[PDB]
Design a protein. Structure first.
Lengths: 115, 115
């Protein structure tokens, strides 16, 4: 099964719907089910990469593509004052779903430290 | 002046030193002067891109390169239990230095929300 075998795989194969913001041959962007800011969406690759520590060097462009799509969607959503992009890796990072995903949060002042 | 005209530009041209972890033709990684976790370093491009919202599509590979170098340095530093990567954009994002930089934090349980 393409898209991997996580909850994200089902979204990718459209077995389950989501508030899809954007989609191309390489990735898909959709709103987070538990937003932590007025605007909070995810950008995930269609290719199954379980975590960033498992990405290959060949995956560079694709990883760079998620940030480019993230900045574009953020513009469409009108995040004029900025935003924060976050990739969590492993238990200390706070990763629960093992399929790489980039968080884009905005619409409020993000604080420091970032968790 | 190459490397841009921010504090990071000076680090890039080596006008001012830093705890450099890694360097190649495309980027440089060094520890944060105000760490927010046991391990907290930055990965910055040598090319001056002021912010993520200003990156061009051609910048994809390079942006993807920062995450790949970040995951490699994290491995060398022994962040076995994971980490969090963060890119701040603009005022709401918390960006103070206008030269793109990726934060890699680890060595402790990162919390949620990420700021």
């Amino acid at each position: 099964r393409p898209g991997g075998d996580t909850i994200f795989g089902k979204i990718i194969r459209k077995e389950i719907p989501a508030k899809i913001i954007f989609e191309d041959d390489q990735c898909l962007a959709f709103h987070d089910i538990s937003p932590q800011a007025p605007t909070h969406f995810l950008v995930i690759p269609k290719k199954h990469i379980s975590q960033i520590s498992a990405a290959e060097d060949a995956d560079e462009s694709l990883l760079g593509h998620l940030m480019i799509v993230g900045k574009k969607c953020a513009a469409d959503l009108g995040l004029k004052k900025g935003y924060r992009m976050v990739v969590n890796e492993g238990s200390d990072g706070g990763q629960s779903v093992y399929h790489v995903h980039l968080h884009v949060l905005g619409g409020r002042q993000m604080n420091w430290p970032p968790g």
